[PDB]
């Protein structure tokens, strides 16, 4: 409820909220198999709240780990692209040429000209 | 005559786009004309219908009748107006659905985005 408030709460408070909503979804599943008419719609509301809390906890964990690792990065934290994009040469490697080619660009580059 | 290469004149494509439209697009498609007094006051011609708008029916068998929008059934392309009803064979009451292109809005429900929308549409219709 109110993910903005969830982002304020600390990790101990967030896991305490997670425990409460799990106990409360269980009490509803007991109600669902016995009898009720308006406790059934609480299932959707509370199941989504459990997802909401776990999303916030997870997003905080990854942001913390991304800060703590900015040497080698863990495999799940690495930039995920297509497999072919990851195998590409860097711009430094793509733009590297040897001396005999760097000289000709220094001495004889293409000029800007016009015909009268 | 249309000039845009990116706009399709295909009747099959236009009917598919109209009928397979998401909810947020049906809101623009389900727009209503403003009344003469409201058009003069706001300098806008047409607005998307909303719940709790006051409306007058100007076409059909309920032409002339007034009420407030109690339902916007976007899935059926109809709005329901207060006390515009019919009796069934069993005597019960059912709201009659009217297309919003056959009504005029007489009173507008304005929260904060209705005013902002009215400002945007006025400027083009004012210049």
């Amino acid at each position: 409820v109110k993910a903005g408030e969830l982002w304020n709460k600390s990790k101990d408070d967030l896991t305490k909220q997670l425990a409460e909503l799990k106990t409360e979804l269980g009490q509803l599943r007991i109600q669902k198999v016995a009898s009720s008419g308006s406790k059934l719609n609480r299932i959707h509301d509370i199941r989504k709240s459990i997802a909401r809390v776990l999303t916030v906890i997870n997003a905080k964990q990854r942001a913390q780990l991304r800060l703590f690792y900015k040497k080698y990065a863990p495999l799940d934290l690495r930039a995920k692209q297509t497999r072919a994009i990851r195998r590409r040469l860097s711009p430094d490697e793509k733009s590297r040429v040897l001396e005999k080619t760097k000289k000709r660009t220094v001495h004889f580059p293409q000029r800007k000209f016009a015909i009268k | 005559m249309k000039r845009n290469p990116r706009v399709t004149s295909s009747r099959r494509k236009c009917r598919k786009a109209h009928f397979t439209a998401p909810s947020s697009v049906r809101r623009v498609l389900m727009s209503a004309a403003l009344s003469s007094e409201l058009r003069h006051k706001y300098n806008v011609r047409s607005i998307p219908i909303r719940k709790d708008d006051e409306v007058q029916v100007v076409r059909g068998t309920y032409k002339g009748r007034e009420g407030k929008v109690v339902q916007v059934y976007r899935r059926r392309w109809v709005i329901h107006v207060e006390r515009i009803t019919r009796e069934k064979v069993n005597g019960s009451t059912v709201n009659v659905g009217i297309h919003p292109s056959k009504v005029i809005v007489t009173k507008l429900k304005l929260d904060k985005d209705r005013k902002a929308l009215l400002d945007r549409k006025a400027r083009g219709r004012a210049a």
């Binding site: 000709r104 001495h107 004889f108 580059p109 293409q110 000029r111 800007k112 000209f113 016009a114 015909i115 | -």
Partner: protein
């Protein structure tokens, strides 16, 4: 074969119908080629759009002995006699052809 016709020679004994080339994209090819010419022209704004300078050569063989046309590039001997270094020539819009000779 029944009358006084030519002897027929139709080269249609293979699967020629899997190798039919139509030309319904001909007006689209013309527009794509035109668009690239305008893009290339803007990429080199003052440089001439017709490419580098070409020499004059005689078309080979006795049928075309007497006709002149554009060659590939200027000989290394022609550039030297005009004072243009062979490394400078391509950069200022002149084509170089080290294969050709002046007889």
């Amino acid at each position: 074969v029944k009358h006084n016709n030519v002897i027929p020679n139709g080269h249609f004994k293979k699967h020629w119908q899997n190798y039919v080339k139509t030309w319904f994209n001909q007006p689209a090819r013309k527009q794509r080629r035109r668009i690239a010419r305008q893009k290339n022209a803007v990429k080199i704004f003052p440089r001439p759009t017709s490419g580098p300078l070409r020499p004059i050569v005689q078309c080979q063989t006795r049928k075309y002995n007497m006709k002149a046309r554009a060659g590939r590039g200027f000989t290394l001997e022609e550039l030297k006699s005009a004072g243009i270094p062979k490394k400078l020539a391509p950069t200022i819009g002149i084509s170089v052809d080290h294969r050709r000779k002046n007889r």
